[PDB]
Amino acid sequence: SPQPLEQIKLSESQLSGRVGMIEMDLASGRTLTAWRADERFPMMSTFKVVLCGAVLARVDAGDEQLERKIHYRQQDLVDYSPVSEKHLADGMTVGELCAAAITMGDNSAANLLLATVGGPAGLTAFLRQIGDNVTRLDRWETELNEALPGDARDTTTPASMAATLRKLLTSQRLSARSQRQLLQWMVDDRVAGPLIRSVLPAGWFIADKTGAGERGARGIVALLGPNNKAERIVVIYLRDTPASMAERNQQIAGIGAALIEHWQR
Ligand SMILES: OC[C@H]1O[C@H](O[C@H]2[C@H](O)[C@@H](O)[C@H](OCCCCCCC3CCCCC3)O[C@@H]2CO)[C@H](O)[C@@H](O)[C@@H]1O
Ligand SMILES: *C(=O)/C=C\N[C@@H](C(=O)O)[C@](C)(Cn1ccnn1)[SH](=O)=O
Numbered sequence: 213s214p215q216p217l218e219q220i221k222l223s224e225s226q227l228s229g230r231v232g233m234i235e236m237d238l239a240s241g242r243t244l245t246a247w248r249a250d251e252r253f254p255m256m257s258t259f260k261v262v263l264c265g266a267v268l269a270r271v272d273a274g275d276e277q278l279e280r281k282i283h284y285r286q287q288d289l290v291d292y293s294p295v296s297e298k299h300l301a302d303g304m305t306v307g308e309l310c311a312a313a314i315t316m317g318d319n320s321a322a323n324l325l326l327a328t329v330g331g332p333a334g335l336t337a338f339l340r341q342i343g344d345n346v347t348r349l350d351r352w353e354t355e356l357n358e359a360l361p362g363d364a365r366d367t368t369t370p371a372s373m374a375a376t377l378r379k380l381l382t383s384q385r386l387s388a389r390s391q392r393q394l395l396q397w398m399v400d401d402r403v404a405g406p407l408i409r410s411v412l413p414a415g416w417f418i419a420d421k422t423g424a425g426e427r428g429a430r431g432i433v434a435l436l437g438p439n440n441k442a443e444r445i446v447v448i449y450l451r452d453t454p455a456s457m458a459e460r461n462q463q464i465a466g467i468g469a470a471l472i473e474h475w476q477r
Contacts, residue, residue, distance in 0.1 A: 229453025253449035257423030278307030293320035428453035
Protein backbone atom coordinates (compact mmCIF):
# COMPACT_ATOMS: atom_id res chain seq x y z
CA SER A 213 0.00 0.00 0.00
CA PRO A 214 0.96 3.68 -0.56
CA GLN A 215 1.62 6.30 2.10
CA PRO A 216 -1.42 7.15 4.31
CA LEU A 217 -1.95 10.59 2.80
CA GLU A 218 -1.63 9.27 -0.74
CA GLN A 219 -4.16 6.51 0.00
CA ILE A 220 -6.60 9.03 1.53
CA LYS A 221 -6.39 11.02 -1.70
CA LEU A 222 -6.86 7.89 -3.82
CA SER A 223 -9.97 7.15 -1.77
CA GLU A 224 -11.54 10.53 -2.54
CA SER A 225 -10.76 10.03 -6.23
CA GLN A 226 -12.33 6.58 -6.30
CA LEU A 227 -15.38 7.49 -4.18
CA SER A 228 -16.00 10.99 -5.57
CA GLY A 229 -16.60 11.96 -1.96
CA ARG A 230 -14.87 13.84 0.86
CA VAL A 231 -12.73 11.97 3.36
CA GLY A 232 -11.90 13.46 6.76
CA MET A 233 -9.11 11.88 8.80
CA ILE A 234 -6.95 12.31 11.90
CA GLU A 235 -4.30 9.92 13.24
CA MET A 236 -3.30 10.88 16.77
CA ASP A 237 -1.12 9.47 19.56
CA LEU A 238 -3.57 8.48 22.32
CA ALA A 239 -1.17 9.12 25.20
CA SER A 240 0.14 12.54 24.12
CA GLY A 241 -2.23 13.89 21.50
CA ARG A 242 0.52 14.23 18.89
CA THR A 243 -1.14 14.63 15.50
CA LEU A 244 0.53 12.44 12.86
CA THR A 245 -1.82 12.64 9.90
CA ALA A 246 -4.48 15.29 9.27
CA TRP A 247 -6.70 15.54 6.18
CA ARG A 248 -9.73 17.87 6.03
CA ALA A 249 -9.37 17.68 9.81
CA ASP A 250 -11.24 20.94 10.34
CA GLU A 251 -14.06 20.18 7.92
CA ARG A 252 -17.51 19.06 9.09
CA PHE A 253 -18.74 15.48 8.75
CA PRO A 254 -21.91 13.81 10.06
CA MET A 255 -21.04 11.85 13.23
CA MET A 256 -23.75 9.26 12.67
CA SER A 257 -23.48 6.36 15.14
CA THR A 258 -20.03 7.47 16.32
CA PHE A 259 -21.72 10.11 18.52
CA LYS A 260 -22.66 7.31 20.92
CA VAL A 261 -19.16 7.17 22.39
CA VAL A 262 -19.43 10.84 23.38
CA LEU A 263 -22.97 10.21 24.63
CA CYS A 264 -21.82 7.51 27.05
CA GLY A 265 -18.93 9.71 28.10
CA ALA A 266 -21.55 12.23 29.27
CA VAL A 267 -23.46 9.47 31.05
CA LEU A 268 -20.27 8.38 32.83
CA ALA A 269 -19.65 12.00 33.84
CA ARG A 270 -23.06 12.01 35.54
CA VAL A 271 -22.21 8.72 37.27
CA ASP A 272 -18.91 10.18 38.50
CA ALA A 273 -20.80 13.19 39.86
CA GLY A 274 -23.27 10.92 41.63
CA ASP A 275 -26.24 12.03 39.51
CA GLU A 276 -26.51 8.66 37.78
CA GLN A 277 -25.76 4.98 38.36
CA LEU A 278 -24.87 2.45 35.69
CA GLU A 279 -26.97 0.03 37.76
CA ARG A 280 -30.14 2.14 37.55
CA LYS A 281 -32.83 0.22 35.72
CA ILE A 282 -34.87 2.18 33.18
CA HIS A 283 -38.29 0.87 32.15
CA TYR A 284 -39.53 1.95 28.75
CA ARG A 285 -42.48 1.31 26.45
CA GLN A 286 -42.76 -0.10 22.92
CA GLN A 287 -43.87 3.31 21.63
CA ASP A 288 -40.47 4.63 22.76
CA LEU A 289 -38.66 2.40 20.28
CA VAL A 290 -37.19 3.70 17.03
CA ASP A 291 -35.71 1.93 14.01
CA TYR A 292 -33.21 -0.82 14.88
CA SER A 293 -33.30 -1.86 18.52
CA PRO A 294 -31.89 -5.43 18.54
CA VAL A 295 -31.30 -5.37 22.29
CA SER A 296 -33.83 -2.90 23.67
CA GLU A 297 -36.81 -4.54 21.93
CA LYS A 298 -36.15 -7.66 24.01
CA HIS A 299 -36.59 -5.90 27.36
CA LEU A 300 -40.01 -4.24 27.28
CA ALA A 301 -41.00 -6.32 30.31
CA ASP A 302 -37.90 -6.06 32.51
CA GLY A 303 -36.18 -2.88 31.36
CA MET A 304 -32.46 -2.22 31.04
CA THR A 305 -29.83 -0.65 33.29
CA VAL A 306 -28.11 2.57 32.23
CA GLY A 307 -24.87 0.63 31.82
CA GLU A 308 -26.64 -2.01 29.70
CA LEU A 309 -28.08 0.75 27.55
CA CYS A 310 -24.59 2.16 26.87
CA ALA A 311 -23.32 -1.32 26.02
CA ALA A 312 -26.26 -1.87 23.67
CA ALA A 313 -25.84 1.53 22.00
CA ILE A 314 -22.09 1.22 21.52
CA THR A 315 -21.50 -2.51 20.97
CA MET A 316 -24.73 -3.45 19.19
CA GLY A 317 -25.73 -0.21 17.48
CA ASP A 318 -29.06 -0.11 19.35
CA ASN A 319 -30.81 3.16 18.40
CA SER A 320 -33.53 3.15 21.01
CA ALA A 321 -30.95 2.55 23.76
CA ALA A 322 -29.14 5.65 22.48
CA ASN A 323 -32.30 7.80 22.57
CA LEU A 324 -33.09 6.69 26.11
CA LEU A 325 -29.56 7.65 27.19
CA LEU A 326 -29.74 10.91 25.24
CA ALA A 327 -32.85 11.85 27.21
CA THR A 328 -30.98 11.33 30.48
CA VAL A 329 -28.30 13.86 29.49
CA GLY A 330 -30.68 16.62 28.45
CA GLY A 331 -31.19 15.56 24.85
CA PRO A 332 -29.16 16.79 21.85
CA ALA A 333 -28.86 20.21 23.48
CA GLY A 334 -27.68 18.64 26.73
CA LEU A 335 -24.98 16.57 25.03
CA THR A 336 -23.80 19.61 23.06
CA ALA A 337 -23.55 21.57 26.32
CA PHE A 338 -21.46 18.70 27.70
CA LEU A 339 -19.14 18.95 24.69
CA ARG A 340 -18.78 22.68 25.30
CA GLN A 341 -18.01 21.95 28.95
CA ILE A 342 -15.05 19.71 28.06
CA GLY A 343 -13.65 22.24 25.62
CA ASP A 344 -15.05 20.96 22.31
CA ASN A 345 -16.44 24.09 20.67
CA VAL A 346 -17.21 22.49 17.30
CA THR A 347 -19.05 19.17 17.68
CA ARG A 348 -22.83 19.44 17.90
CA LEU A 349 -25.78 17.06 18.17
CA ASP A 350 -29.12 18.49 17.09
CA ARG A 351 -31.39 15.52 16.54
CA TRP A 352 -32.29 12.06 17.83
CA GLU A 353 -32.04 8.60 16.28
CA THR A 354 -32.57 8.01 13.53
CA GLU A 355 -32.97 11.46 11.94
CA LEU A 356 -29.45 12.47 13.02
CA ASN A 357 -28.06 10.22 10.24
CA GLU A 358 -29.73 12.19 7.42
CA ALA A 359 -26.45 13.76 6.27
CA LEU A 360 -27.96 16.46 4.07
CA PRO A 361 -25.42 18.32 1.91
CA GLY A 362 -24.22 21.47 3.66
CA ASP A 363 -26.23 20.73 6.81
CA ALA A 364 -24.29 21.54 9.99
CA ARG A 365 -26.61 19.53 12.23
CA ASP A 366 -25.19 16.51 14.06
CA THR A 367 -21.63 17.07 12.87
CA THR A 368 -18.09 17.04 14.19
CA THR A 369 -14.69 17.52 12.56
CA PRO A 370 -11.95 14.85 12.56
CA ALA A 371 -9.74 17.05 14.75
CA SER A 372 -12.53 17.84 17.24
CA MET A 373 -13.67 14.22 17.57
CA ALA A 374 -10.14 12.89 18.05
CA ALA A 375 -9.42 15.53 20.71
CA THR A 376 -12.73 14.87 22.47
CA LEU A 377 -12.28 11.09 22.47
CA ARG A 378 -8.79 11.54 23.88
CA LYS A 379 -10.15 13.83 26.61
CA LEU A 380 -12.80 11.30 27.61
CA LEU A 381 -10.45 8.32 27.61
CA THR A 382 -7.32 9.82 29.16
CA SER A 383 -7.55 13.39 30.54
CA GLN A 384 -8.82 12.34 33.97
CA ARG A 385 -11.96 14.42 33.42
CA LEU A 386 -13.71 11.08 33.97
CA SER A 387 -12.81 8.86 36.94
CA ALA A 388 -10.33 6.02 36.43
CA ARG A 389 -13.12 3.44 36.47
CA SER A 390 -15.23 5.44 34.01
CA GLN A 391 -12.33 5.88 31.55
CA ARG A 392 -11.79 2.11 31.72
CA GLN A 393 -15.48 1.46 31.14
CA LEU A 394 -15.71 3.69 28.06
CA LEU A 395 -12.64 1.97 26.64
CA GLN A 396 -14.02 -1.52 27.28
CA TRP A 397 -17.28 -0.63 25.50
CA MET A 398 -15.28 0.27 22.37
CA VAL A 399 -13.19 -2.89 22.73
CA ASP A 400 -16.44 -4.87 22.93
CA ASP A 401 -17.97 -3.61 19.68
CA ARG A 402 -19.82 -6.54 18.11
CA VAL A 403 -20.75 -4.78 14.85
CA ALA A 404 -17.35 -4.14 13.24
CA GLY A 405 -14.82 -5.18 15.89
CA PRO A 406 -14.75 -8.93 15.10
CA LEU A 407 -14.68 -8.34 11.34
CA ILE A 408 -11.76 -5.90 11.65
CA ARG A 409 -9.74 -8.32 13.79
CA SER A 410 -10.32 -11.10 11.26
CA VAL A 411 -8.44 -8.99 8.71
CA LEU A 412 -5.91 -7.27 10.97
CA PRO A 413 -2.40 -8.78 10.98
CA ALA A 414 -1.53 -10.55 14.23
CA GLY A 415 -0.39 -8.17 16.96
CA TRP A 416 -2.70 -5.26 16.18
CA PHE A 417 -5.06 -3.87 18.83
CA ILE A 418 -8.47 -2.54 17.81
CA ALA A 419 -11.30 -0.83 19.70
CA ASP A 420 -13.98 1.06 17.79
CA LYS A 421 -17.40 2.51 17.06
CA THR A 422 -18.60 2.76 13.45
CA GLY A 423 -21.47 4.61 11.83
CA ALA A 424 -23.28 5.05 8.53
CA GLY A 425 -25.74 7.54 7.08
CA GLU A 426 -27.38 8.78 3.89
CA ARG A 427 -25.57 10.03 0.79
CA GLY A 428 -22.72 7.63 1.44
CA ALA A 429 -21.94 8.97 4.92
CA ARG A 430 -19.70 6.51 6.75
CA GLY A 431 -17.29 6.72 9.64
CA ILE A 432 -15.24 5.17 12.35
CA VAL A 433 -13.59 6.28 15.56
CA ALA A 434 -10.98 3.82 16.74
CA LEU A 435 -7.96 2.94 18.81
CA LEU A 436 -5.27 1.08 16.88
CA GLY A 437 -1.72 -0.05 17.43
CA PRO A 438 0.95 -2.76 17.12
CA ASN A 439 2.17 -4.93 19.99
CA ASN A 440 -1.44 -5.22 21.16
CA LYS A 441 -1.51 -1.65 22.46
CA ALA A 442 -4.06 1.13 21.86
CA GLU A 443 -1.32 3.42 20.56
CA ARG A 444 -3.29 5.79 18.35
CA ILE A 445 -6.71 7.30 17.88
CA VAL A 446 -7.81 7.10 14.26
CA VAL A 447 -10.88 8.98 13.08
CA ILE A 448 -12.14 8.57 9.51
CA TYR A 449 -15.32 10.05 8.08
CA LEU A 450 -16.69 9.83 4.56
CA ARG A 451 -19.47 11.94 3.07
CA ASP A 452 -21.25 12.73 -0.19
CA THR A 453 -20.26 9.66 -2.20
CA PRO A 454 -22.69 7.49 -4.21
CA ALA A 455 -20.53 4.39 -3.65
CA SER A 456 -21.81 1.07 -2.35
CA MET A 457 -21.38 0.30 1.34
CA ALA A 458 -18.90 -2.41 0.36
CA GLU A 459 -16.64 0.01 -1.49
CA ARG A 460 -16.84 2.59 1.28
CA ASN A 461 -15.84 -0.15 3.73
CA GLN A 462 -13.00 -1.18 1.41
CA GLN A 463 -11.65 2.37 1.11
CA ILE A 464 -11.59 2.92 4.87
CA ALA A 465 -9.88 -0.46 5.29
CA GLY A 466 -7.39 0.64 2.63
CA ILE A 467 -6.49 3.72 4.65
CA GLY A 468 -6.01 1.44 7.64
CA ALA A 469 -3.76 -0.81 5.55
CA ALA A 470 -1.60 2.19 4.59
CA LEU A 471 -1.23 3.14 8.26
CA ILE A 472 -0.30 -0.43 9.16
CA GLU A 473 2.33 -0.67 6.41
CA HIS A 474 3.81 2.74 7.24
CA TRP A 475 3.34 2.97 11.01
CA GLN A 476 6.64 4.50 12.14
CA ARG A 477 6.10 8.18 11.39
O1 LIG B 1 3.59 -5.90 6.21
C1 LIG B 1 2.42 -5.50 6.95
C2 LIG B 1 1.28 -6.57 6.86
O2 LIG B 1 0.70 -6.61 5.50
C3 LIG B 1 -0.42 -7.49 5.41
O3 LIG B 1 -1.48 -7.02 6.29
C4 LIG B 1 -2.64 -6.51 5.57
C5 LIG B 1 -3.88 -7.42 5.82
O4 LIG B 1 -3.73 -8.65 5.09
C6 LIG B 1 -5.20 -6.70 5.38
O5 LIG B 1 -6.35 -7.50 5.71
C7 LIG B 1 -5.27 -5.27 6.01
O6 LIG B 1 -6.48 -4.53 5.55
C8 LIG B 1 -6.98 -3.68 6.59
C9 LIG B 1 -7.68 -4.53 7.64
C10 LIG B 1 -8.26 -3.67 8.74
C11 LIG B 1 -9.32 -2.73 8.20
C12 LIG B 1 -9.80 -1.75 9.25
C13 LIG B 1 -8.65 -0.93 9.81
C14 LIG B 1 -9.23 0.26 10.53
C15 LIG B 1 -8.49 0.52 11.89
C16 LIG B 1 -9.14 1.74 12.65
C17 LIG B 1 -9.24 3.04 11.75
C18 LIG B 1 -9.84 2.77 10.30
C19 LIG B 1 -9.15 1.53 9.61
O7 LIG B 1 -4.15 -4.53 5.57
C20 LIG B 1 -2.90 -5.05 6.05
C21 LIG B 1 -1.73 -4.10 5.65
O8 LIG B 1 -1.44 -4.17 4.25
C22 LIG B 1 0.02 -8.96 5.72
O9 LIG B 1 -1.08 -9.88 5.58
C23 LIG B 1 0.67 -9.09 7.13
O10 LIG B 1 1.27 -10.39 7.26
C24 LIG B 1 1.74 -7.97 7.37
O11 LIG B 1 2.03 -7.88 8.78
C1 LIG C 1 -24.68 3.56 13.31
O1 LIG C 1 -24.09 2.56 13.57
C2 LIG C 1 -25.31 3.74 11.94
C3 LIG C 1 -25.70 2.63 11.12
N1 LIG C 1 -25.54 1.36 11.50
C4 LIG C 1 -25.94 0.35 10.51
C5 LIG C 1 -24.81 0.15 9.50
O2 LIG C 1 -23.62 0.11 9.88
O3 LIG C 1 -25.08 0.02 8.29
C6 LIG C 1 -26.38 -0.99 11.19
C7 LIG C 1 -26.84 -2.00 10.12
C8 LIG C 1 -27.56 -0.72 12.18
N2 LIG C 1 -28.75 -0.19 11.49
C9 LIG C 1 -30.31 0.98 10.63
C10 LIG C 1 -29.12 1.07 11.27
N3 LIG C 1 -30.61 -0.32 10.50
N4 LIG C 1 -29.65 -1.05 11.03
S1 LIG C 1 -25.04 -1.72 12.14
O4 LIG C 1 -24.11 -2.30 11.21
O5 LIG C 1 -24.56 -0.82 13.15
